Model the fold of this input.
Amino acid sequence: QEQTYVISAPKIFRVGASENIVIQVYGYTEAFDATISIKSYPDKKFSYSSGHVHLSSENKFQNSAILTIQPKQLPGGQNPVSYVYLEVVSKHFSKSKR
Amino acid sequence: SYQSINIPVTQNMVPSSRLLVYYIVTGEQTAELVSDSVWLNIEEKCGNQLQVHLSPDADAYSPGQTVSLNMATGMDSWVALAAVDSAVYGVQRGAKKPLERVFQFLEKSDLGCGAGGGLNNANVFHLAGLTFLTNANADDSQENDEPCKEILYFPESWLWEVHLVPRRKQLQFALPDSLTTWEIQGVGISNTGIC
Amino acid sequence: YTCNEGYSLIGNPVARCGEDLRWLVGEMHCQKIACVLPVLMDGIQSHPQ
Amino acid sequence: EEIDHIGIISFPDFKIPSNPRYGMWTIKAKYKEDFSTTGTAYFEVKEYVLPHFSVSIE
Amino acid sequence: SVAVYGQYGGQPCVGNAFETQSCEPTRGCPTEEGCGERFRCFSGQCISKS
Done:
């Protein structure tokens, strides 16, 4: 289990806030790219924001995306959105958390 | 041994910032995320460094005296001004100045609680106000948003206005006829924030 | 979007690159941040015009 | 309601009603459409005359 | 593959059925997920902490 990652994020996303999401990976030497994405929940269909991030020893395999949830893109109405998927996708891993 | 965190405490850090340090160690075969954090108390300071003063400085003025006022700033700014008589606050025992607590109120935005540390990596991140996705055998789903609450002419008012200060401005105006200490207070605003 | 100095953006500030490969825009417009002489009863003269 | 252009929302002057209930009034502020962001302030309405001097009891 | 199966005591095909080449990979090696809140057995299997 040498190849590993951490994506770290605010405990709670503020709507309309510009939120800076940072990623570190370990046990990698070939430079590779990942995308960190904010997607509708549970269906993951609509994407509120996405950030391509490149990882290399040139970055010491560290980077961040600035991602935001513009308030009109939420469906709104009587039931406001309580939860949203944060996602990361790469050649090596894919994960999402509510 | 490791490079220290040698960094400028830039203006964005005021009034408070939190430092979290972390690594993953692969162990023999199983990774572990190791982290620690500390609350860093920062000097309360404005980004505009805005200052306001009476250019004809005097210990006391006479009623109706014409005066000049200067607003000076490190950058171009809006400023609101207002004047209020001190007997007004004298009316109510324990009256509050409306711009009191502004930094402590801004601090209520901070998602963390406690001064740092934690029972665990997950606990460290949660108390730091973060969450994390990792395969390194830890998850923040162990914890929840508990209510953590640990401790770390004779007008009454005039000059109620807003002005642009293109780095500098000068105003000229007449005092009222009342006798008192007038408290003149103002708030600078720009894309650099409040002062 | 953001409007020039002395302006502000009205409507939804946001545009999106749609799957049509073209910009959707939020019906937005830049209002100038200024007053104007209102419809006075008799067009009364303004001295610092 | 008022529209901000500066960060400084100079609302119209609120005329106190012609017969108020005396005591602690409250002002609440919200962004109209899309945020909670609820601000609050209090003010007291009373028949009073300004004190002519402070008494401080220590 | 075998083109003709040996039969009735005829000789089996000699040598290996496979060969290997080095490449430059187009695809990344998938990483393990962790155990998260689950206990991790040394092999990497996960079980309930209970």
Notes: DSSP finds no helices and two strands in chain E. The radius of gyration of chain E is 23 Å. Chains E and D do not touch (no CB pair under 8 Å).
